[PDB]
Ligand binder design. Structure first.
Ligand SMILES: Brc1ncnc2nc[nH]c12
Ligand SMILES: Brc1ncnc2nc[nH]c12
Ligand SMILES: Brc1ncnc2nc[nH]c12
Ligand SMILES: Brc1ncnc2nc[nH]c12
Ligand SMILES: Brc1ncnc2nc[nH]c12
Ligand SMILES: Brc1ncnc2nc[nH]c12
Lengths: 167, 167, 165, 167, 167, 165
């Protein structure tokens, strides 16, 4: 029933390797900001750990084990504190980090909101069984991105993936 | 220390959408068969559930919810009974089902053996942080596929991913 | 130990088959509604609609509806910080029991609120329930405690006075 | 794949006390003892903890906290060690202990096999959604009780509950 | 991102009995009470369970099973409700209770903040690997105790233990 | 209940700093070696080598070595069906305690095998240890029980006779 205070703690998982992916993340935060059921949102790429012993760090480059552990754990920490996951899932370039986080969250029995995006709304609709069955709620990013602003994250109502070929 | 009987229960995760992926799986089973530390190996694509109410089933096609649940659960069942995971991980075509299973297994604190394969041993070596940090042991598929036959699955000795750019 | 804000997130599980059971549920919602340590309450029966289900209650239900409804409850269990169970000692609801075992396997606290209309029978309880529950509040004589119980910390209160089977 | 040594570790859950129920349990053991895939079977009612500090143990009595604690724990230990659960489920007199155990195992992602028994096959077939959905494989006690001797507990293939009204 | 309402639910673990230790705990509370990101703080020694059936409660005595059970459980409940753990860790007299609690929380994937205190800053700096690796963020009690008032418990950014010998 | 094959998978945790501690560990391995209910035993100190570490015991260790070694233990905890702890009551090993809490959060059984060289002091134990452990075998007077204990089912034996703090 109606909550006394916002309780949703969103773990916003998302690729961040292209302008389009980056714009979706931006857009997602905005909508989430308009949702009255949200108490907090964590985006893994917002802050960052800095390793002093790490001289001249580069992206996609070799990183120190210390930076790697700290950054990975901040993400797991985000998942731990989150009550649910929201994944801006690029269906054109499958992100394994996101897929990994979806499985982790489900192993913890946490609800997972999948928001698929494709630049080819007209190509075949197929999805991996693990993703298709692991997620508890699907919200198409192409045509319903906006309900993130209204979805009741206090209870995360289920909505099984349907309409996708399974492989 | 030395085990009285084999105790390793391997969950062999792997894409199965190309001849090359299919040959690796085949090869993997053979090596695993030669390993004295293995009590059992589960390959998700070996058996299969059959839904009677499912008329004319097709691969990649729309599947019944009953078949979807049963098949997904057989996989989770495999992960549950497994003591460790071994992933024939295609680095050229990232498989999200596999990535999902890697995260699930790690959320359960189970050791995960990553065996990466690439048809371009000469291209840049980069890996997602979640995969790079989530796996506990890496065995290159291109140059060490064969140690699967000797690895001590009774204890799954760690071997951190190194030599890969992190993104 | 004094919360800055209410944190208690209650999963209120109970059978919803008889009028009596529907009454208890009705009362609990109100009682918990007056507790200042509660941030939110979730009640399973407050549902999903399979647009493809041509559907009777108690009848054969589509797998899609079954999956979504079952998940909505587990999701309520996941979000909850504790469980409050309007537990029927006369008609044992295995669903409620399942959920109690699920929550405990998750290490979360479970407040057992038993009810009986047969005070005549020897008060007894299954071991798993007797030992699994962390806090018991008699529904026949302490129901009102739910409006005052501190769900921010859910103080323990082991089951006693019940014969074990 | 074929197991090198039996892998199934069964948690055999069942109500006792009722003459019929005891019979079921006894026959289940026999059936299981004949299954090559089973490595071990734990039945909670077999042996028990004796509280030396317990005067006159009343079976159904107001038993001491030490006995209760040790007995309850001996069951969780069995659930913990078990790879799968097999429940002799009485559809005539619902045993909440069993139900408890089923959800506990499912929260652990362990496979659960339901073997329902009814002395009233003429009565309506109904099942609580939590059981019907939580269970991973059903094997009708009244009709396929014998299957327990052939079921491959090394993989516990799933068989979704069906044909039951759901309330 | 910025939280809409305090999200941090702290499990404040610490040894008691020792005059110094009590002081630490008292100051930690003050510091925490000043942190805007904190929603609630649970300290195991604050209030307690009273076993009406317990004659003359001996603090350090052979306490009854009911008291023990209710007290131990009240702590797990706090760990369960908590989003993160903050441990006032005595490097001079290792408290195994605290250690227990740290591993329990890590098995749950919850973030753990170590605040080490030593009355002998001249002695060698060493730490048991399990603590040094299990801990997700360290905040020197002797030097940065005040940080507890600024630390964003809505996300618990990590800070790997370093500068300690490991045995 | 009679295993077809040994299933017990033991995670043997203990401090490995003093000669005495190194002796107990030595004995346990042998005792467990005679138990027919055991399929395998894992002992943390039996290690990893960071080819890039130029390394002293107790010294500063590379993060890579730290990560791999720590993981090897958690992996041993994951594979194990139960834990056997050669627990020192004179010099509390927080590593062992951490691992005990980890295993219990995983619902696995933990056999506490305490040892003391000071029978003179009031036998006491921390609550979390006293309540977390599921089976206790006195290392000073029952050490040998480990060769006969049934690890296929690890029968419970709550801690008693210890004052609680
Ligand atoms: Br992936 C990935 N890469 C780099 N920084 C990160 N933080 C969180 N997830 C990250
Ligand atoms: Br993916 C995927 N697709 C089809 N069948 C499967 N079984 C296990 N995993 C599977
Ligand atoms: Br149980 C159970 N049975 C039927 N419908 C439900 N909705 C929520 N929980 C339910
Ligand atoms: Br007695 C006894 N022994 C083992 N498991 C049980 N569940 C309920 N009562 C039980
Ligand atoms: Br007393 C008491 N109360 C709460 N937590 C504790 N840990 C050890 N002893 C404790
Ligand atoms: Br603890 C601990 N400390 C140092 N080395 C180890 N290897 C295994 N467990 C260890």
């Amino acid at each position: 029933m109606k909550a006394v205070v916002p309780t949703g703690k969103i773990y916003l998982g998302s690729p961040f390797y292209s302008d389009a992916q980056r714009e979706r993340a931006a857009k997602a935060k905005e909508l989430l900001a308009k949702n009255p059921s949200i108490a907090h949102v964590f985006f893994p790429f917002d802050d960052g750990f800095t390793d002093p012993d790490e001289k001249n760090p580069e992206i996609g480059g070799i990183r120190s084990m210390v930076w790697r552990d700290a950054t990975y754990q901040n993400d797991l920490t985000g998942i731990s504190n989150a009550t649910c996951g929201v994944f801006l899932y690029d269906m054109d370039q499958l992100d394994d980090g996101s897929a990994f986080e979806i499985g982790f969250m489900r192993a913890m029995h946490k609800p997972v909101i999948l928001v698929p995006f494709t630049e080819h709304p007209e190509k075949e609709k197929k999805m991996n069984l693990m993703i298709a069955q692991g997620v508890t709620t699907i919200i198409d990013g192409n045509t319903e991105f906006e309900k993130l602003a209204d979805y009741n994250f206090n209870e995360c109502p289920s909505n099984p993936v349907r309409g996708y070929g399974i492989y």
